[PDB]
């Protein structure tokens, strides 16, 4: 039974891809990719663009591409807690967390540079006073 | 002493500046700015770079530029809840919120475009299917 067999193989590959954080790799997408997993080109494309990669083109321009630095609210929160330097290592105010996340947004998903760090430190020094 | 008067006028300008969310405009920075608030150029520089603007430069090259659209974690959360389409204003999983925030990070602080929206919708369909 090739229909149920390949359907189940697609669901197994897709499940293994989904647990790996590869969200676009649905069972349907795996089936359209030739019942096969995503290529490094498609994977890198999704990692750097968050656009669904076309299932049957291999994206040979993305195979050797640098993983785009992308930060999670959790990483932003950790960096904000470290920069704020709160007494008792406590979470900073949400306004400072928003400022740090906006800094990450300005840097295409990267952390603050040494000039943005002076701004974040001055903001912390002004917020812990107020 | 006119110096303490100037200090108090600086501190009042600084209070009005940060009540508005303009954080860099400390009393000290206002005093270094010529005892006045930030110019539109300085304010554009800080809004677009989050770097402290030099206190007496006019940053005109940023006057004729436009304000970068940034997003807060609250705006990210609202966009994630709207895109996920949860019944009853229910928070999406933190993985989907992280996906939306990473989309925002790719766009220099902007919202998702059409193709990133289709990706986020497919991701939502898979997260509601598995959960």
UniProtKB/Swiss-Prot annotation, chain B:
The chain holds residues 846 to 976 of 1012 of the full protein. Homodimer. Interacts (via C-terminus) with VP1 in the cytoplasm. Interacts with VP2. It is found in: Virion; Host cytoplasm. It comes from Avian infectious bursal disease virus (IBDV). It comes from the Viruses. This is Capsid protein VP3. Transmembrane segments: none annotated.
């Amino acid at each position: 039974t090739p229909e149920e067999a390949q359907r189940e193989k697609d669901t197994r590959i897709s499940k293994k891809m989904e647990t790996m954080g590869i969200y676009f790799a649905t069972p349907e997408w795996v089936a359209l990719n030739g019942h096969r997993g995503p290529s490094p080109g498609q994977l890198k494309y999704w990692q750097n663009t968050r656009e669904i990669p076309d299932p049957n083109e291999d994206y040979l321009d993305y195979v050797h591409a640098e993983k785009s630095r992308l930060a999670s609210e959790e990483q932003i929160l950790r960096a904000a807690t470290s920069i704020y330097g709160a007494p008792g290592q406590a979470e900073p105010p949400q306004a400072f967390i928003d400022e740090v996340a906006k800094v990450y947004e300005i840097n295409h998903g990267r952390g603050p540079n040494q000039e943005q760090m002076k701004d974040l430190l001055l903001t912390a020094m002004e917020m812990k006073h107020r």
